[PDB]
Amino acid sequence: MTVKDILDAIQSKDATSADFAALQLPESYRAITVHKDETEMFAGLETRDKDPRKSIHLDEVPVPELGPGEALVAVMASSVNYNSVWTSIFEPVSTFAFLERYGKLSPLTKRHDLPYHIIGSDLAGVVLRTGPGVNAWQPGDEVVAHCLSVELESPDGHDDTMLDPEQRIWGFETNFGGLAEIALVKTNQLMPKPKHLTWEEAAAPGLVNSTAYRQLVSRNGAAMKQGDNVLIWGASGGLGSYATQFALAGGANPICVVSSPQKAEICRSMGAEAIIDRNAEGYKFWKDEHTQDPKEWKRFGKRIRELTGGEDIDIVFEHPGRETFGASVYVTRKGGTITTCASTSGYMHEYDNRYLWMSLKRIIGSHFANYREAYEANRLIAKGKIHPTLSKTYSLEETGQAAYDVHRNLHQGKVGVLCLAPEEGLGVRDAEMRAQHIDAINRFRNV
Amino acid sequence: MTVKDILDAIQSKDATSADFAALQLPESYRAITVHKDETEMFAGLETRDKDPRKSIHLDEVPVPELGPGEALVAVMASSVNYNSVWTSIFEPVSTFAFLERYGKLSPLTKRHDLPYHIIGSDLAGVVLRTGPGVNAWQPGDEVVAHCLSVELESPDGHDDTMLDPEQRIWGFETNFGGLAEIALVKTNQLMPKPKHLTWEEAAAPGLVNSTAYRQLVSRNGAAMKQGDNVLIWGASGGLGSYATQFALAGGANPICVVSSPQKAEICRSMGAEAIIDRNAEGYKFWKDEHTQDPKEWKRFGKRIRELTGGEDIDIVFEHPGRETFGASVYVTRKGGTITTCASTSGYMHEYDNRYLWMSLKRIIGSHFANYREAYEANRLIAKGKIHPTLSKTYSLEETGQAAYDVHRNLHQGKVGVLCLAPEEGLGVRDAEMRAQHIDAINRFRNV
């Protein structure tokens, strides 16, 4: 309840880093959790019938012991991600399974094995304390976080951090996540908060924006250049949305795939011009559960070439998986690249390798981002080149609903959660720049 | 005749380039053809039972009219490739199909549209004539050809020749192929003949060797480095046999896959140590027609890790396709590369994308080689770092038998064919360099 003083300092204009170091830490703080004893509570239910509102709690939890390379952070806002939702419906298996294995290494990792699991993989807020060996970050710094958690003990990840052998995700494979008033992070997660954004907007892009950055823009991904034709599946929502922004900002031409006229319009408001509606076109890429339709590939490809004016796809931004993959490979230009980071419709991909090898195409696997790529992504927001796609904000004590919202896919844009922030709209330091980009910032509201 | 007179000049030491240039081209030369009026002779018979002995003809054919950027060459020796076999059994469709579509375009492509198709995609011999616009090659030059045929009119291949939209394969989608006394080639197919090799030894690596170089060694493929663990399917045969040589020569560790211990012995005589017999260890990656077995993948990986001392595969040399692909993707190291150029077992690939995206792996399709890559491949042979894999040499008039040999798959080493050469063993100029590598050159003899 001395949490109020902590908020007062953040809200205070003249509060110094000394003041922040002087703030007493609360004995407990409010946190969204799932409980270890409740992991089997959806037994006998199909996934869709599982209600996150039944599993999610709002607990007074004690502040974790702070270790080396770590920071405690007063969280003003977080977001609900797909992985948070999975955690809440305990699928494929409870997150406690790993937390229990992991917690057996050292006393530091044991901290994470608790009867409750604090979730959330995004964060906008301010540093409260730092641990041994931390010098880059001081108490009072306004920050956002990425969710890659790595000890970098193995050599593997020192020429690209994603290749670390025990790479984990903060709030998912970690306790003390961001859907709470206070969080515990590795400082190698902390990034500067863009000054022209609200807490909730700052927390919004995180995991989804960086994934798109590595996958499409970085040299570990498609290494996109201006002029490239980029096929973007699910262009109007989550992942596809940020990919569309990167395609546009970096001078490429995005071909946007959607399910409805409403979603086509969302794409257009981003500045996308070439749009395909799978539904209105009625693509049936799969003739049945075991055989694909090369005639549907050819028709999809015909439609693309019409919009480009004779030209095939340089880069496919993939993530639906099985349903689309055959077509994705097919429509790609000779020498082109298929870039994948998920398989939402099924992970068993089938494609015709003749179109891959004979056309000199490549398939590249991407996943989240390393600290540089995540910084660079966050930087592009701070420069006002990429914009957050926040759609709706819930309060902390409505996080169950917030998860239900994402679970039932009710919105294309991001679903935000205020943690310490008492209301929406707070945390802007650069009014001049917000006013200059506000229209783009507010593109995804309520949609 | 007039042809014997050409052979006389070739077999001479004296003969100047001035002599060659004054030599008379014959009215007709001997050549291996298939007939346009005999394409439906495979009837309803199954693939295995199709016999190239009954379809391959030895015809007396007129010399084609020479065009710009082209050369006529007296062919001393050639070789039987897979594409030659497919042609002679008319699968998946006749080659007279494309050739008729091709000849309608230019009056010089009309040359390639004849009642007969002179086949063959490998070549060692000596330049007879060059057409307008060619200076780099003179009558009398000892040459070996690569089989890429590109007009390069489009901008697409000017940063990598393979990306040409109208890339054709010489002898396959072209007439006047290698298996004849004279061949017609583009001059951008010509390379210097390795002086320490017999005519037939020089012709053996061509197609198969350049393919393996681009796929594994070059920047367009795996870009292999010393210390890498390379999984090489079909390691004792054609393609794998050169892949295995490149892996060793470049200081990588080849993990060779074979189906018999006889084949294992070939891989050891190449200096490879880590060997898996798929047949003796009874790997069954497909539980049935539609479903794979991840336990078998896993078991295969454990055997790999057993041979490498704990390490997964850096680079996979794929070409079998559907049967082995799923396993390839599994067993590749985090951040590693799967490299593919065929799908002999079937082109409809199925793999688990979770293993691709989450481990940051990549599938790079490759196909043949560009002029630079073909030259570099042939140069590594010239420098005696890579050796021909000759198994048996047939005469011109025994080609049908050699074709039958390759289709039945009775030999591991490349099958050679004498064309103009009266006997095996002619063409050596550096006997001293031959002396140094002779055992290595002969590793595949009668194997």
Curated annotation (Swiss-Prot), chains A, B:
Thermal dependence: Optimum temperature is 40 degrees Celsius.
pH dependence: Optimum pH is 6.5.
CDD domains for the chain: crotonyl_coA_red
Name of one Pfam family that matches: ADH_zinc_N
Keyword flag Mitochondrion: no
Inhibition and activation profile: Inhibited by divalent cations (30-100%), beta-chloromercuribenzoate (85%), iodoacetamide (40%) and N-ethylmaleamide (80%). The presence of CoA thioesters containing 12-20 carbon atoms results in inhibition of enzyme activity. The greatest degree of inhibition is observed in the presence of palmitoyl-CoA and myristoyl-CoA. The branched-chain fatty acids, isopalmitoyl-CoA and isomyristoyl-CoA are less effective inhibitors of the crotonyl-CoA reductase. Concentrations of NADPH above 200 uM lead to inhibition of enzyme activity.
Entries under NCBIfam families matching the protein: crot-CoA-red (TIGR01751)
The species this protein was found in: Streptomyces collinus
EC number: 1.3.1.86
Quaternary data: Homodimer.
Catalyzed reactions per annotation: butanoyl-CoA + NADP(+) = (2E)-butenoyl-CoA + NADPH + H(+)
Protein name: Crotonyl-CoA reductase
InterPro entries in the record: ADH-like_C (IPR013149), ADH-like_N (IPR013154), Crot_CoA_red (IPR010085), GroES-like_sf (IPR011032), NAD(P)-bd_dom_sf (IPR036291), PKS_ER (IPR020843), Zinc-ADH_QOR/CCCR (IPR051603)
Coiled-coil stretches: none
Keywords, in A-Z order: Metal-binding, NADP, Oxidoreductase, Zinc
Family in the record: Belongs to the zinc-containing alcohol dehydrogenase family. Crotonyl-CoA carboxylase/reductase subfamily.
SMART domains assigned to the protein according to its UniProt record, in alphabetical order: PKS_ER
Purpose: May play a role in supplying butyryl-CoA for straight-chain fatty acid biosynthesis. Catalyzes the conversion of crotonyl-CoA to butyryl-CoA. It shows a high substrate specificity for crotonyl-CoA, a short-chain-length (C4), but no measurable activity is observed with shorter (C3) or longer-chain-length enoyl-CoA thioesters.
MF terms in GO: crotonyl-CoA reductase activity; metal ion binding; NADP binding
EC class name: oxidoreductase
